[PDB]
């Protein structure tokens, strides 16, 4: 029940890692990871958070997991290559790590299992994209955005079932950094960079395939990190005019966005996920 921002990016790249809770509008410190990690893709499966990538000292492709229960993180096999900004999902028991930016910008996609501690090729995208939010609904994984030879307005949909991806309806700007978060049916995409950092927000039906715009944030947030609990989108941290610690809160109900309590730090590719 608590939202866990994960690295990311403001004085320097952060291993630090905290918790918020929404019942107190506190933030408080956990224990860091083994090393700093922004544009990190986090994923929450077996009762841990995964922190998958990002980059540091370099483009990383070393994953750790969090247990709460102890407060302690744990190595998990790296990935096939580095991926800084890299999406992840989780699917079918399985933790998907897609595109990213290696040694050049990816469409390659691998799946995680933790029951083999083993990951595995998928189906690549088509499209390279750096920086590509990512959600599921529907079972499928939906990669919107991101960094290809520019940012991205496109989106496709992966099934895992038949190891495809598929064209969906492309957003109305391009982003790239952008969170996506998925509640009521819908996928909402939650500012990044354009051709500027990013207020905006639209909201994508699958049962259409059509995207609406939503009311905007009080901020721009490039690279922003988003989170679904208790009816509402979190959006995390992020790039305005400056690598921004501040939060803010989405109610679908009113259409309406309203700050909550900051953290402890500026954190931009903050990683964001709900345990």
Same mark, same amino acid.
């Given at each position: 029940?608590?939202?866990?921002? *994960? %690295? ?5 790249? !952060? ?8 019942? /107190?509008?506190?933030? $408080? ?102 920086? *590509? %939010? ?5 079972? !499928? ?8 030879? /520019?940012?991205?307005? $496109? ?121």
């Amino acid at each position: 029940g608590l939202i866990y921002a *994960v %690295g990311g990016d403001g004085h320097t790249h !952060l291993s630090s890692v905290e918790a918020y809770n929404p019942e /107190t509008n506190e933030w $408080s410190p956990v224990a860091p990871m083994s090393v700093p990690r922004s544009g990190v893709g986090v994923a929450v499966i077996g009762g841990l958070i995964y922190a998958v990538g990002g980059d540091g000292h370099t483009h990383l492709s070393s994953v750790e997991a969090y247990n709460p229960e102890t407060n302690e993180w744990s190595p998990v096999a790296p990935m096939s290559v580095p991926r800084s900004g890299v999406g992840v999902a989780v699917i079918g028991g399985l933790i998907y790590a897609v595109g990213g930016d290696g040694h050049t910008h990816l469409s390659s996609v691998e799946a995680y299992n933790p029951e083999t501690n083993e990951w595995s090729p998928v189906a690549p995208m088509s499209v390279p994209r750096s920086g *590509v %939010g990512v959600a599921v609904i529907g079972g !499928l994984i939906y990669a919107v955005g991101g960094d290809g030879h /520019t940012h991205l307005s $496109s989106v496709e949909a992966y099934n895992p079932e038949t190891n495809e991806w598929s064209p969906v309806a492309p957003m109305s700007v391009p982003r790239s950094g952008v969170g996506v978060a998925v509640i009521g049916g819908l996928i909402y995409a939650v500012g990044g960079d354009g051709h500027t950092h990013l207020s905006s927000v639209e909201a994508y039906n699958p049962e259409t395939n059509e995207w609406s715009p939503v009311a905007p944030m009080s901020v721009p947030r490039s690279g922003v990190g988003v989170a679904v609990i208790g009816g509402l989108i979190y959006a995390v941290g992020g790039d305005g005019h400056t690598h921004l610690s501040s939060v803010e809160a989405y109610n679908p109900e009113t259409n309406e966005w309203s700050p909550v309590a900051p953290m402890s730090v500026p954190r931009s590719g903050v990683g964001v996920a709900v345990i």
